[PDB]
Design a protein around this ligand. Sequence first.
Ligand SMILES: *Cc1c(COP(=O)(O)O)cnc(C)c1O
Ligand SMILES: *Cc1c(COP(=O)(O)O)cnc(C)c1O
Lengths: 271, 271
Amino acid sequence: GHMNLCYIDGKFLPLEEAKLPVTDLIIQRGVGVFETISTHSRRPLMLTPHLKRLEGSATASSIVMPATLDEMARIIREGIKKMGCETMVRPYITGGDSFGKDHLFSSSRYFVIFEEIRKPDPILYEKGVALHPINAERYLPSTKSINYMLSFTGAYEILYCPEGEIVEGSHSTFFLIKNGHLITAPTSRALSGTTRQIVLELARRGNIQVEERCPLLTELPEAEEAFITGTVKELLPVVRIGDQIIGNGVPGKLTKHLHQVYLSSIVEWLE
Amino acid sequence: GHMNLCYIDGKFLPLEEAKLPVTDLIIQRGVGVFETISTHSRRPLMLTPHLKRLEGSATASSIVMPATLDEMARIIREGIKKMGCETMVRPYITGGDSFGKDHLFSSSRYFVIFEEIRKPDPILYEKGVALHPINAERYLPSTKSINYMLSFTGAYEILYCPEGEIVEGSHSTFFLIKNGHLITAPTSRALSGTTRQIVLELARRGNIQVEERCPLLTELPEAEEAFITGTVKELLPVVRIGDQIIGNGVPGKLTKHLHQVYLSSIVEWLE
Ligand SMILES: *Cc1c(COP(=O)(O)O)cnc(C)c1O
Ligand SMILES: *Cc1c(COP(=O)(O)O)cnc(C)c1O
């Protein structure tokens, strides 16, 4: 049950027992990609878009897939059935031991972490969160790499704001609400969020105008609302960015409305 | 007796046998710092400067040191003795399993890789190497982190050239030579290379003028020579940067002079 698992070397292990060889370039060189897959009603949300993003992350990184996507789906479904609870699933693809003379990681490893889902505390949805702007970007923005060093080094999350242009969180898509419009960075600059996609579909159905541009930090004084999106956090209101209050400093009407519509509609994106 | 080693969990293991728990945030979140220490006639080169930079990297990354520098030195010396050969030594400090409430990694793991040294092939010193320029920088450039993903995805090595200002290689310090002067990025922008420090010292003794500035890509048609530095590679001549031939396309006079002076002088930096 609630026992954390790691699928590795053909076996479901207890998470605490799973170990990776120190020869792996994930450890030595940060060469790895991953996903976060979450469940509602014990069914994986957006499993296929997640597994396709994993393959695109691996392929863009010159990592050969160590298993087929059908094999990764089989593992993730079996690990969910073992958990018998709301599960957060993280498949990892590693570099393995060698970057060959043909410029590929050909001996990639994989493993799959299964944990009980840990939603953000209700207080954070009620009051919203603060983001810490940095003058930095993610390079390879379509790749979901294991590199979170900058995310660590009292804000909930860092926000990549290269040259004052807001792109996205370390873990999260960023939305701004300004002159009634939903503003979010294009996926030429931000990761192709699965939550981002669902919100843009709910915005379309709600006749909510979407600008796919990077909002400037300098527009934040005129914004009504902000939120961040991810499979676990769903839509989390953002009330402060650095020392700039967003709107009236509390979660806004449209953020809460899109969150409700997301929870009402969520079964349509389950697999 | 002879094998590649990993010091981990108090034990010298075979490198092939050593494993890290997948819970470690080096794996999950790229929270890791390391050094590369080489031996000359089995004496560790710049052991103390390497270990002090390792402490600098961990400290700047909010990682609490899981061992003392004296304990790391004792491990590194005992592992060199066990190898019985010219060794490349890589001590790693991990994030461990958690980032605590106090915004520190307080449960850091450490391990020490010992491998028989692998110099670049003599043909690379005779012909020199090519570098691939990218419009990107290292964030927290003073930290020697495990994050090399951009070195493989983005030529012997990538060259970080944010806004066409040359900073450094992915693995190496970059030197340009123009009218007999040595040009290299200041430590305000580049990792403070130990090989870099040695070359700057040997230049000063040689009455070779040093400019500590980032050379422009547009200075490369006017350059006589270029090389890169790192503890294993020593001074590797650079003859091409993207489409630009450096000098007359072969290793230059002053590069070969500084490499011989480096090899002649090396015993003063051994411990
Ligand atoms: C994982 C991640 C997200 C969120 O992706 P979802 O598919 O919505 O969970 C957003 N931005 C970045 C940078 C991420 O790594
Ligand atoms: C390790 C490294 C170097 C080389 O430093 P040495 O002390 O000379 O081995 C240079 N640049 C970067 C970015 C490095 O990580």
